[PDB]
Design a protein around this nucleic acid. Structure first.
Lengths: 63, 155, 117, 146
RNA sequence: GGGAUGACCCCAGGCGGUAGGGGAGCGUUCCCGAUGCCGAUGAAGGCCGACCCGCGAGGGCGGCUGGAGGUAAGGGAAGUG
RNA sequence: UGGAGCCUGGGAGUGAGGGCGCGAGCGAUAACGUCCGCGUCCGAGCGCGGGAACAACCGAGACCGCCAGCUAAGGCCCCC
RNA sequence: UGGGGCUAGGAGUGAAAAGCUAACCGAGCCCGGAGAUAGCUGGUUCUCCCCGAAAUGACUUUAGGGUCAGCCUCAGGCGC
RNA sequence: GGGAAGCAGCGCCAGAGAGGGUGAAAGCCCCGUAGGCGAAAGGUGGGGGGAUAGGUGAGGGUACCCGAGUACCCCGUGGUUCGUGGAGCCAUGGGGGAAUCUGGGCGGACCACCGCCUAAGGCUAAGUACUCCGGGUGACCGAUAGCGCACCAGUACCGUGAGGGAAAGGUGAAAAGAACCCCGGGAGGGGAGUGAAAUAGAGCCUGAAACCGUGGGCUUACAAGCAGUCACGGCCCCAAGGGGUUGUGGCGUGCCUAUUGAAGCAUGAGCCGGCGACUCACGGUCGUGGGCGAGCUUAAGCCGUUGAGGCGGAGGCGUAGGGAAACCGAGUCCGAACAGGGCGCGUCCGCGGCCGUGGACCCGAAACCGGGCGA
RNA sequence: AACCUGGGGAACUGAAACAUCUCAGUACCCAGAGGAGAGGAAAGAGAAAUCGACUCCCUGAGUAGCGGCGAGCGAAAGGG
RNA sequence: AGAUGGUAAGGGCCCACGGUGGAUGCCUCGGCACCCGAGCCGAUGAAGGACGUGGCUACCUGCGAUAAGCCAGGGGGAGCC
């Protein structure tokens, strides 16, 4: 009775005005050593599709 | 439910090489003795209707009635002193023979006492006007005090 | 409010058993053996109305042949004749003329072998 | 009005969906016909395969709180002057909660969009943009908490 | 398509079907309608029918049995087949 | 101009396939064997006609009714 | 061999079979936790109308279970 | 009419037309209902009155007292949202071990500032919990239902014991419960008689189905079958039409489940009746019938009603977005950047579909743990 | 009969294995109280130039936080 | 040289009337839920029992060797054991 928010999603993914699900590109916490400055440079956030409808459902109460 | 049922939990028979079918305990709902599946439990059916929508109706109710020409608000209660006879008479002077039913609304205890026992009367104080009572009757009669507190109940 | 079975079940049951009068043994007693029987009985009937239309095709044709073979020719020939002869008539049904009024059947055979030889 | 045809208009539809019959939703109950459709399934939203969620994505949304808790600091509620457009005289926070906007969400920040209007406006903050637009007649009662 | 929208007349197409999706109905118990309406000149239930109305689930009609209950039009709940 | 198509959303089931024809691998140019690829029919058309009988070979996509008429595969000595 | 006593459930007893411990002991019986759990097997109830699948791919302590894609359906919009 | 309370003629009460009873269906026949009364005795009882016990000031000086194996520190643990963590606070098994207001603890390691509170003695109504017990109500059940038990039930009966645990209600308004005769050892019947009714005659209302009989019509001893259907033809019963039966001819692989595929020699079912499986609560998300709209909406409670509704804005959603954050704001973030680039234009109730948490469509293990009972 | 405080205190299960974690201070055992019991007049809350014993309801809030940061668990102040 | 009629040990279908059995409907000294009220007893021997008690008495009920009952106060008014 009465849903609980999935703390480990809140802890890692913000949800936009339009209702899109936005988080940080994977693959750079010890990859590095020598990859292109291009690779590691290219880590800002992104969209996800279809699978965010699931994410969202879990951040019920807070929105 | 099959837990609120009286019986013991023991396994009625072995399960395996008995020849009968496989069973649990006898509180199970396939058991004629048994518990009952999706049965009623005590529950609360009430809900908060928009207070606005309550007002509209109360008002829309009295209107229809007045349109019919069946609303009559009054003042002079000569049929007083809590006696059925008196009211009876007063009511015929007003043109109420008991050929239609009447919601008689007033703050006056004694006029209320007088009617009541007539089958064609539903008596009621002004605080408790409500659309059900209004509709289930054919004709509506108000005291002026009663019509007042009805206007204050709107705006 | 409980709403127990009540009268309902019996009534669906004997609706059917009336439908089953006079089938052998348990098939007019039992309110489910009867059902199973009635299923096939249904299908059988549908299939068989279809069939009736065919069973009489055979009859009409079998005896026309008998009758017109009694004048020299055969059925194959006779029908071809009428076709050319312009008599969209007989209607195999209505060659019972062969039995009532063979006078007039005889006439039709002449017309037929008219267009045929 | 009579007691026949208070009849709820057009769409009440109380007709729920029952699956016991040989027409509509049979044997299996309108869905099902297999296994793990039988008293429970694992989620989904978040679950399954037994694979690796999409808890593979990380929390750079870092800075996420230590033991004694969150810190109690002052919070600011915005309101575009476009909304101030209605009412006239002197606008003051608390007079704004007594109306559609603000309520208890604490310190008022007037800011933003729409044409301004000649009057004194009491606040805790204005944006650059907002303060200028209030040049064509107005106020800078500011600071407060005093 | 008529278009005096008449839900009635005219024309032309579609209508095999498991898992499933969607749309209409029929029946069971209980509540308002009810201080009412039916009822011993016969309620409910039961037994018969080749009759009437529904595509159908069903609903009428008639005859026998039964002996005190039953409950419209229009709506509302569910231990509902 | 089609129970075509595209866009957004609510509800599913399925995730065990099978035979036939054609193109290859495995196998022994064996298997109602087994692996993929292109198509079909059964599945769900074990409804109907032909094939002696018979899911998938040939004919054909079954709203109901008729003691009317033309055909298809296959047939016209008797069973028929 | 009669009568009177003592030792019990990971415990007793055992000239040792995992034997015996109230007619089934590799851990007694009763009640409770309890409606344990059961990716497994079985069963699921009135009528008519329209549409109508799948047995593939990816990942899966996965392989008769799942999650996304694909194929069925309804509603809104777009209009060759 | 067996019986009036039905129907009809003419009346009356109502602060009483809740309900139950009377041979059927009654405001005025009975018991009641509205309304109003009543305790010698025992319980209860600041709700309303009285009486005690107990308690109420200010300065100025001394600095005598303010709860000890305690505070406090260290080691081992528990409580809290806190699982070693930057780990405080509150409790404490072990070791050390103070001070009496220039005394001592707390404000999340610690130090300094600024503040909060006085540990190591005790009591204290009310608001809250429950229901063996009594009363009132019911869009609760009506004898496989409802408690396990409507009935002499924790009974019979089962077990050494702890413990397990059923079945089984109904003549009639009134017993008027069939004197007497007849056959029979009786039990039963047949006359007679009571009754409106006796296939209401006593495990007696209604009395359905399986199952077992008797009587009547059609029908069968050279056939062969998922038991039927279509067509003719004969016989038998009210009339140019129907119903019953079946001689011959045509055609025809049970139901369910499970399956690539079942008449299948694959699963289930002797037959009949009755019981038997997608629910409810609270969140969520679409859809939909309404209300009000840049706004919409109340929760607990308080006042009424005794099947009446009002009040109550604490709160909640919405009106602005970006950023880990400081923050800025129609923008904002990475960036030195008037480069580029990412994100950035309603609510309440009803109804219906699906999801989360709870057995959550229903029946089923082998086992695991606790407390008892058995030599 | 329940209801209450103290001293002791499981496992099935969930984590789609399991050991920390969960079920849970639950089930259960024991002692004590009473028509209730517990608590209770600050060595308190926590940031307010603040409140002012204790208990109980609605909010706060699935928030702050805790967590093999998994499964999951989950406050207090403040306002009515 | 020829022919379709004709028997029922028994069997099948239909119709009528009974037997068994206890579904259905109607009925209710009983149950379930919620809300109110009320809330401890015991060494002055409880809760719970055993045995006993009637002119005649199996069981239930009530009582306790004073045993279906003994004393007094209050309530009621024609029937009781």
């Amino acid at each position: 009775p009465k849903m609980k928010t999935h703390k480990g999603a809140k802890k890692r993914v913000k949800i936009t005005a339009s209702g899109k699900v936005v988080a940080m590109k994977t693959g750079k916490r010890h990859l590095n050593w020598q990859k292109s400055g291009k690779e590691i440079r290219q880590k800002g956030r992104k969209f996800v599709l279809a699978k965010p409808e699931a994410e969202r459902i879990k951040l019920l109460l807070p929105y | 439910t099959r837990g609120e049922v009286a019986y013991s939990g023991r396994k009625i028979w072995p399960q395996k090489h008995t020849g009968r079918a496989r069973h649990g305990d006898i509180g199970a709902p396939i058991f004629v003795g048994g518990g009952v599946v999706f049965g009623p439990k005590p529950r609360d059916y009430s809900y908060t209707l928009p207070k606005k929508v309550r007002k509209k109706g109360l008002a829309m109710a009295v209107a229809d009635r007045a349109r019919e020409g069946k609303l009559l608000l009054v003042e002079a209660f000569a049929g007083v002193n809590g006696k059925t006879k008196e009211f009876l008479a007063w009511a015929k002077e007003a043109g109420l023979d008991g050929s239609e039913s009447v919601l008689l609304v007033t703050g006056n205890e004694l006029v209320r006492r007088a009617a009541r026992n007539l089958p064609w009367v539903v008596t009621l104080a002004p605080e408790g006007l409500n659309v059900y009572d209004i509709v289930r009757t054919e004709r509506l009669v108000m005291d002026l005090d009663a019509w007042e507190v009805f206007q204050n109940r709107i705006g | 409010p409980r709403a127990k079975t009540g009268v309902v079940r019996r009534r669906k049951h004997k609706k059917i058993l009336k439908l089953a009068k006079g089938y052998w043994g348990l098939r007019s007693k039992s309110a489910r053996k009867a059902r199973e029987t009635l299923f096939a009985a249904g299908n059988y009937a549908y299939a068989h109305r279809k069939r009736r239309k065919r069973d009489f095709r055979r009859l009409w044709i079998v005896r026309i042949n008998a009758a017109c073979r009694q004048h020299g020719l055969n059925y194959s020939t006779f029908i071809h004749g009428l076709k050319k002869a312009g008599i969209e008539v007989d209607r195999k049904n209505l060659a019972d003329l062969a039995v009532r009024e063979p006078q007039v059947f005889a006439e039709l055979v002449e017309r037929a072998k008219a267009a045929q030889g | 009005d009579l007691r026949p045809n208070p009849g709820a208009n057009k769409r009440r539809k109380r007709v729920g969906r029952g699956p016991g019959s040989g027409h509509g939703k049979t044997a299996t109950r309108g869905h099902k016909g297999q296994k793990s459709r039988s008293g429970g399934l694992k989620d989904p939203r978040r679950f399954e395969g037994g694979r690796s969620t999409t808890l593979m994505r990380l929390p750079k949304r870092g800075m996420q709180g230590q033991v004694p808790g969150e810190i109690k600091r002052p919070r600011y509620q915005g309101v575009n002057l476009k909304d101030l457009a209605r009412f006239e005289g002197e606008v003051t926070p608390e007079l704004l909660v007594r109306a559609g906007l603000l309520k208890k969400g604490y310190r008022l920040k007037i800011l933003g969009e729409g044409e301004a209007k000649p009057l004194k406006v009491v606040a805790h903050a204005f944006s650059k943009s907002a303060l200028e637009k209030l040049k064509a007649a107005g106020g800078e009662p500011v600071l407060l908490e005093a």
